[PDB]
Amino acid sequence: VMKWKTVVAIFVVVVVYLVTGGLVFRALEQPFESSQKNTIALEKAEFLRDHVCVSPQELETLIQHALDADNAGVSPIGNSSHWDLGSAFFFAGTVITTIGYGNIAPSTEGGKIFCILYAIFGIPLFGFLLAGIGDQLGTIFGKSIARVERVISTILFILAGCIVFVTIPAVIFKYIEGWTALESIYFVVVTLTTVGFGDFVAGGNAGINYREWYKPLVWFWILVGLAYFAAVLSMIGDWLRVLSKKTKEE
Amino acid sequence: WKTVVAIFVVVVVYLVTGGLVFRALEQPFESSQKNTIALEKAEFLRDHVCVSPQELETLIQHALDADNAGVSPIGNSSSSHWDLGSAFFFAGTVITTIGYGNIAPSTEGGKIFCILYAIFGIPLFGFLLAGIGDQLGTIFGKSIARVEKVFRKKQVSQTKIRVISTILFILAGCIVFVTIPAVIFKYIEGWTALESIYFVVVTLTTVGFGDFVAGGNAYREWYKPLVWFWILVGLAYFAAVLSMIGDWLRVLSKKTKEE
Amino acid sequence: QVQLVESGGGLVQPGRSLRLSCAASGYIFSSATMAWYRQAPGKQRELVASITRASNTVYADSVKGRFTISRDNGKNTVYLQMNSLKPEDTAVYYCNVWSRGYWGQGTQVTVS
Amino acid sequence: QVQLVESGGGLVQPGRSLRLSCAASGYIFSSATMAWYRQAPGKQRELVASITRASNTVYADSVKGRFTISRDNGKNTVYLQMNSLKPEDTAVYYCNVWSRGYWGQGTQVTVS
Ligand SMILES: CC(C)CCC[C@@H](C)[C@H]1CC[C@H]2[C@@H]3CC=C4C[C@@H](OC(=O)CCC(=O)O)CC[C@]4(C)[C@H]3CC[C@]12C
Ligand SMILES: CC(C)CCC[C@@H](C)[C@H]1CC[C@H]2[C@@H]3CC=C4C[C@@H](OC(=O)CCC(=O)O)CC[C@]4(C)[C@H]3CC[C@]12C
Ligand SMILES: CC(C)CCC[C@@H](C)[C@H]1CC[C@H]2[C@@H]3CC=C4C[C@@H](OC(=O)CCC(=O)O)CC[C@]4(C)[C@H]3CC[C@]12C
Ligand SMILES: CC(C)CCC[C@@H](C)[C@H]1CC[C@H]2[C@@H]3CC=C4C[C@@H](OC(=O)CCC(=O)O)CC[C@]4(C)[C@H]3CC[C@]12C
Ligand SMILES: [Ba+2]
Ligand SMILES: [Ba+2]
Ligand SMILES: [Ba+2]
Ligand SMILES: [Ba+2]
């Protein structure tokens, strides 16, 4: 369908975007990363001064041992299982939605085999549901737009959608998880775009006693929010095709 | 809405079914692992009397939370993961929606830029991934044109020709995009055959848990760009395979609805 | 200049609750781990509670389930909600920036 | 019954290399963290090197860049490649299952 001449041109654009993005990310993060890596060394040195009976290599072995155990599925904190039916149901959701935070991940050989098969049939099974949710949201918006009666309608769909799916949930996340306004917005975008870094996960802190309705309401918001973000990202993808066609003619 | 609510029940059943299998497969081993970590901490506290249990717990929590916040608590580093090399590969995880999370923005400015980067970057990458799929489909169409000519003279039914072609596309694709790279990952990263296959599936399905990341353990010069080239062609192959499964579910649902 | 100002100590009755606060300044509070310590008259410095940059809390076994540490990054203040106080909690409480050597003046909490 | 059998010690010349090995048994080796310690005649036990379950290595500052710890999970053996030996490395080397209290017999390595 698409000629190789257009494909190789689009590939160069993406490589430029990746190198440009990388330069912005390096300038924004590297100075703060160097500042953070100095304070962590100071903390470790002050800990060694306060605990003479612990040698630097013993402290380093302990820190590495704790990080590698946490990465392997076993939390080195406490004496709170993240594989109970509750957390396991929500983990299964991250697989079919392709968000995959990584906070919870299979450690058993059998769990890795099952996870491979779970995504193979689960991702296309969820895609059918997400298509239906998007059609239901489009029909709900089409019914509201009929009362108001295309450029104004697209701006209204984006603005009203940003209120109920992005701002309203982020305000709740700020008042519940203790995240800042920016960290809550960042979480909403990363979650509803299926990127799911895992640095921010709703219902992850052990200290706070979350509400019963909290965790399923977050996962209901994910279901409707993914369908809304798919429509918005499709509009941006269509906008780029119209912009490329206008620039190709001129 | 009648079909949507029926599909929603199917997904909830699938989620509860999967959640039960995952609990039975992981919880006994997790309880076993959480007992040995407690024993190791208790033996450490016995060997280092000057460290109280709450101080050890504060240290472990402090190291885990610092690592999760972007700063590695290992070494002194006078190994930055924000250099142009790792920053280019991080930008890739954003536009491909894999997002391992091993590297993530810690600065307020970096979080603002990452929001805008995904907004325009994800649909920009989608256009490239569509073109890669068309190029792979044209390459397979050129190879299948010689195979279908042999099957045409052997009087195999025209509908079955497409059936054999879809099985060949899946089998040959699984060799070059799944098995061949996983064999390389086993011989390079030191991962087992299962962990390498698990990594390939999780990566090419854009799930990206981050538990397994290529080129992460403290590599060859050609390794990192060859892994990211495999991601580009592998995502396009997995998109086509997952679309075939999505289409087969629609055909299976239509046959079941009539009967 | 790192300064940690403490408040909320003093003489209290056993069983009754008490709340300590710590106004922090002169450093990036958002990324630092806060902690509360207690110096008993006949004992050494003891870690009571500690809240990490990601709001995770760690407590001493003697104060578990009674004391609650919480941080308010918006006001740069670390709190220590001491409930069901026993005469064993009579000690000077210090506010600390865990593993950074920054300490407060110390507020005497007396339970009798 | 956890058993740690050591090999590869003995009298060596300064500058010359030497390799210690530790055959482990009676426990899940793959998930455990291995370590090597040294008891100098006039000093206490000192951690030399330690390889975690994910093959990450931690070394003492005195042996950094000279000693190399490596694990062979297939043969349940932990190795210690001691290169460029100095007379300061003359000590009894013990194989340990880090923070589990399981120790070997100890192989005397003499550098003179
Ligand atoms: C734990 C927290 C973070 C959860 C977040 C809350 C969500 C589950 C809420 C917030 C806004 C809600 C939406 C706000 C508006 C609508 C329109 C609504 O449409 C109608 O009822 C039609 C009205 C009409 O046009 O007459 C359907 C539900 C929906 C999508 C709501 C679904 C549930 C949402 C996404
Ligand atoms: C978050 C930061 C990184 C700012 C994002 C800015 C975007 C709005 C820019 C970045 C790259 C731009 C694209 C770079 C290349 C092109 C190709 C261009 O088409 C052609 O030049 C035709 C030939 C070709 O296919 O390359 C049309 C505009 C477009 C999609 C650009 C549209 C606007 C984009 C997405
Ligand atoms: C660091 C490691 C893990 C990287 C993995 C290696 C990949 C980059 C390789 C493995 C198999 C390769 C593929 C094997 C076969 C082909 C068919 C090939 O098609 C032709 O040359 C047409 C031949 C013809 O039909 O006549 C185009 C490249 C491609 C997709 C290759 C692209 C590069 C791939 C994905
Ligand atoms: C990795 C493990 C979990 C095994 C995966 C097995 C799959 C091959 C199964 C699991 C759920 C099944 C689906 C469950 C429900 C349906 C609806 C069914 O259609 C109807 O019954 C019509 C009404 C409706 O829409 O529900 C058609 C088959 C299908 C897609 C099934 C096809 C086969 C699926 C994907
Ligand atoms: Ba992730
Ligand atoms: Ba993802
Ligand atoms: Ba992590
Ligand atoms: Ba025939």
Author numbering:
A (entry chain A): 71 to 149, 154 to 223, 237 to 337
B (entry chain B): 74 to 151, 154 to 293, 297 to 337
C (entry chain C), D (entry chain D): 1 to 112
Text lifted from the article:
Two-Pore Domain K+ channels (K2P) are a distinct subset of K+ channels where each gene encodes a subunit with two pore-forming domains that dimerise to create a single pseudo tetrameric K+ selective channel across the membrane. These channels underlie the background K+ currents that control the membrane potential in many different cell types where their activity is often regulated by diverse stimuli. In particular, the TREK subfamily of K2P channels (TREK-1, TREK-2 and TRAAK) are regulated by a wide variety of physical and chemical stimuli. To address the issue of selectivity, here we generate camelid antibody fragments (nanobodies) against the TREK-2 (KCNK10) K2P K+ channel and identify selective binders including several that directly modulate channel activity.
Unlike Nb-Activator-67, the second activatory nanobody (CA10776, hereafter referred to as Nb-Activator-76 or Nb76) exhibited highly selective activation of TREK-2 with an efficacy of 412 ± 14 nM and had no effect on TREK-1 or other K2P channels tested, even when used at high concentration. The structure of this nanobody in complex with TREK-2 reveals extensive contacts between the side of the Cap domain and the CDR loops. The most significant contact involves W98 on CDR3 of the nanobody which inserts into the intersubunit groove between helices in the Cap domain to form a polar interaction with E128 of TREK-2. Also, R53 on CDR2 helps anchor the nanobody to the Cap helices by H-bonding with Q106 on TREK-2. In particular, N56 on CDR2 H-bonds with N292 on the P2-M4 loop of TREK-2. The importance of this interaction with the P2-M4 loop is confirmed by mutation of N56 on Nb-Activator-76 which reduces its activatory effect. Consistent with an activated state, both M4 helices in this structure are also in the Up conformation. ML335 is a small molecule TREK channel agonist that binds within the ‘K2P Modulator Pocket’, a cryptic binding site created by the displacement of the top of M4 where its interactions with the P2-M4 loop and Pore-Helix-1 (PH1) are proposed to stabilise TREK-2 in a more conductive conformation. It is therefore highly significant that the interaction of Nb-Activator-76 with the P2-M4 loop also induces a displacement in the top of the M4 helix similar to that seen in the ML335-bound structures of TREK-2. But unlike other TREK structures where this M4 tryptophan has rotated inwards, here the adjacent residues on PH1 (F164) also flips orientation to interact with the top of M4 to stabilise this displacement. The role of ions in gating the filter is unclear because crystals of sufficient quality could only be obtained using a crystallisation solution containing Ba2+ which contributes to the crystal contacts.
